[PDB]
């Protein structure tokens, strides 16, 4: 729900940002239309075309105000002020970004070290694309297919899954894709018994 | 001490319009009591001169339409400086004045008449008065940039990264 | 085509398979490159859909970070859509990529709008979209059709605006 | 008029890019991250170009004097005229820089020159640091 709230907030914020920006184009489109009608026709919105025949903006001349010490020095020192501001928020935003990056990054080094020091080794290991997920996952070939077995029903392929809850490693076979639970070990544990 | 810019400054005089009403005849009379009317302008000097004497495209159209405007030239040609003159009028609600200053350069070698130079823009809309587009554009752009910054920082907060997938939401 | 001698085969008025007259269509390097890239990616998508019928990743191709990455994506596209039997197509695509004035679709649309707002000939418009000229006279000499047809101020404005529109690499 | 014409075309393309990013954000499903980055960078650099070009031609914009058309009727379109006429900032930005100045708060001049010398010293120091190690 917070994601929906923030998405709506950013939508309305960008709409507010663009509403004021539209009026700049609405004003500035008038000059060319006054100078050249045909080029200017398409620039304005249909409502503004209906409002008036466009010849609105015409060139005019006004002199530049006489300069003095009064306003430039204050203008530039206050620009110094806003850019010192921008530097402050620059440092703050960079600090926040680096703190977030450091925390997350050390988290994936924690998982990374768990993976590195949890995996042992000869074994036929490769990457495969999951039928359901479509991503790349590690798989190990453990069947007797290359040892001389003619059993074609099963390929002896087990996918490696890092257990999120226990931070351990588990093997999921290809054939038994129906049992989805933690009781896989006992549900699949079969045996051969000889009675005399 | 915080001052509201005179460009956005808007004066309303309900008593004057109630007493006299809005007309081209007294539009300058309506403007007289406003803060925008400088007391150092030669128009006020002409006003006291008249008072003492009594006690003792569309530019050419409005030129030829009114005789008091004539009297305005024949009383204003003698005095050079900051003066208030009408720009255009469309009845019964729209009037705009022309804010220009005159320097009657009568020096030898200049065949042109007195120099007329703009100073300000004033628009009389209804009973209200209005007085740079560059500032408008930069203000709109900067507010748009602020809103964009807020949206982008929120979106980057929403962003989450994993090494094995990339960035997702 | 100094004197706009396009011949019968390339007349301004074209008769399509529907029998209606159409304006002759001319595309510069950017427009032609974008059109051919769009056609190739659409054909690749159709091929993938057909293969899935008999039996995400495409967003990265159109959006290229750099020229070299764009060229690598182009090579992959040619390998997966053309078969490598057409060297002339590869040479033309490389020439388009290396000397494409404009990479983004919106900027190309801006250039098209700027060039064809005046209503010039499609040949002249495509030539201006292909050639970047510093001065109006340079374009007028290098494009003899533009002589006597466009004012020098307008040509200078168009050339300066186009030079400003060029996306920095 | 040429300067305002260039401002017009550039601002029109900027508004077109804004409309673009708008109608690809309005979808109920968010596209890939990379497309969003490309759109952001393109539109934002375009805004930079807008700012630079508006900077370049301040004199032409200032010289122009605004005046309503004789043919334009104000009696019926006074609301539309007032809409474009108004220029006061949105309030939130106003108190935003008011709090910013509140937080920021011959002495000022000598701090200014001290900032000058710190800036120059830091620039020279990083030039030296870059020169210390061969980066080619």
């Amino acid at each position: 729900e917070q994601f929906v709230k923030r998405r709506r907030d950013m939508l309305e914020h960008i709409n507010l940002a663009m509403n004021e920006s539209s009026l700049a184009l609405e004003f500035v489109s008038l000059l060319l239309s006054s100078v050249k009608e045909s080029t200017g026709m398409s620039s304005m919105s249909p409502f503004l075309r209906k409002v008036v025949k466009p010849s609105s903006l015409n060139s005019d001349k006004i002199p530049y105000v006489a300069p003095t010490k009064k306003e430039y020095i204050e203008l530039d020192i206050l620009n110094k002020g806003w850019k010192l501001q921008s530097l402050n928020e620059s440092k703050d935003l960079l600090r926040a970004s680096f703190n977030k990056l450091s925390s997350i990054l050390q988290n994936e080094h924690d998982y990374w070290n768990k993976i590195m020091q949890s995996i042992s080794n000869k074994d036929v290991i490769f990457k495969i694309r999951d039928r359901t997920s479509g991503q790349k996952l590690l798989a190990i070939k453990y069947g007797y297919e290359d040892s001389g077995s003619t059993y074609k029903h099963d390929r002896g392929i087990a996918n490696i899954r890092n257990n999120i809850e226990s931070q351990n490693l588990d093997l999921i076979p290809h054939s038994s894709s129906v049992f989805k639970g933690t009781d896989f070990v006992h549900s699949v544990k079969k045996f051969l018994r000889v009675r005399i | 001490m915080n001052v509201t810019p005179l460009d956005e400054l808007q004066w309303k005089s309900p008593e004057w319009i109630q007493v006299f009403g809005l007309r081209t005849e007294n539009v300058l009379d309506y403007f007289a009591e406003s803060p925008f009317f400088d007391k150092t302008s030669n128009n006020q000097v002409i006003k006291m001169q008249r008072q003492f004497s009594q006690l003792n495209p569309a530019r050419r159209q409005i030129l030829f339409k009114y005789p008091m405007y004539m009297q305005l030239e024949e009383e204003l040609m003698k005095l050079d400086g900051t003066e208030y003159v009408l720009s255009s009028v469309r009845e019964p609600d729209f009037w705009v004045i022309r804010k220009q200053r005159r320097t009657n350069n009568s020096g030898v070698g200049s065949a042109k008449g007195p120099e007329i130079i703009p100073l300000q823009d004033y628009y009389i809309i209804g009973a209200n008065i209005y007085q740079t587009i560059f500032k408008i554009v930069q203000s709109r752009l900067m507010s748009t940039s602020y809103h964009l910054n807020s949206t982008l920082e929120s979106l980057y907060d929403l962003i989450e990264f994993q090494p094995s997938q990339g960035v997702h939401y | 085509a100094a004197t706009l001698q396009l011949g019968q085969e390339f007349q301004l008025k074209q008769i399509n398979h529907q029998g209606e007259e159409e304006e002759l269509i001319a595309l510069n390097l950017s427009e032609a490159r974008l059109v051919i890239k769009e056609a190739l990616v659409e054909r690749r998508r159709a091929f993938k859909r057909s293969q899935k019928k008999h039996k995400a990743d495409d967003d990265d191709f159109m959006h290229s970070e750099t020229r070299e990455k764009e060229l690598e994506s182009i090579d992959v596209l040619l390998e997966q859509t053309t078969g490598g039997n057409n060297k002339d197509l590869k040479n033309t695509m490389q020439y388009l990529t290396n000397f494409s004035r404009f990479r983004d679709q919106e900027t190309v649309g801006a250039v098209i709008q700027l060039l064809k707002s005046t209503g010039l000939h499609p040949f002249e418009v495509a030539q201006l979209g292909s050639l970047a000229c510093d001065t109006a006279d340079e374009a007028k000499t290098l494009i003899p059709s533009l002589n006597n047809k466009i004012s020098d101020d307008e040509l200078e404005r168009i050339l300066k605006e186009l030079s400003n529109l060029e996306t920095l690499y | 008029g040429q300067a305002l014409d260039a401002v017009r075309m550039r601002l029109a393309q900027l508004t077109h890019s804004l409309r673009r990013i708008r109608d690809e954000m309005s979808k109920a499903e968010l596209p890939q991250w990379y497309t969003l980055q490309s759109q952001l960078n393109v539109t934002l650099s375009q805004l930079v170009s807008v700012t630079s070009t508006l900077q370049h031609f301040q004199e032409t914009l200032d010289s122009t004097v605004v005046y309503p058309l004789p043919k334009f009727p104000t009696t019926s379109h006074e609301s539309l005229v007032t809409t474009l006429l108004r220029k006061k900032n949105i309030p939130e930005v106003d108190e935003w820089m008011k709090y910013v100045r509140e937080t920021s708060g011959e002495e000022i001049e000598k701090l200014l020159q001290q900032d000058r010398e710190i800036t120059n010293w830091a620039r020279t120091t990083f030039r030296n640091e870059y020169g210390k190690h061969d980066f080619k």
Partner: peptide, 25 residues
Amino acid sequence: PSYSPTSPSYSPTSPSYSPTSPSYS
């Protein structure tokens, strides 16, 4: 020509922020 015109983005609902103060005589 022109690939596409701009959609009308008028905001009459915007309340505006005109400062009013010199009304008293």
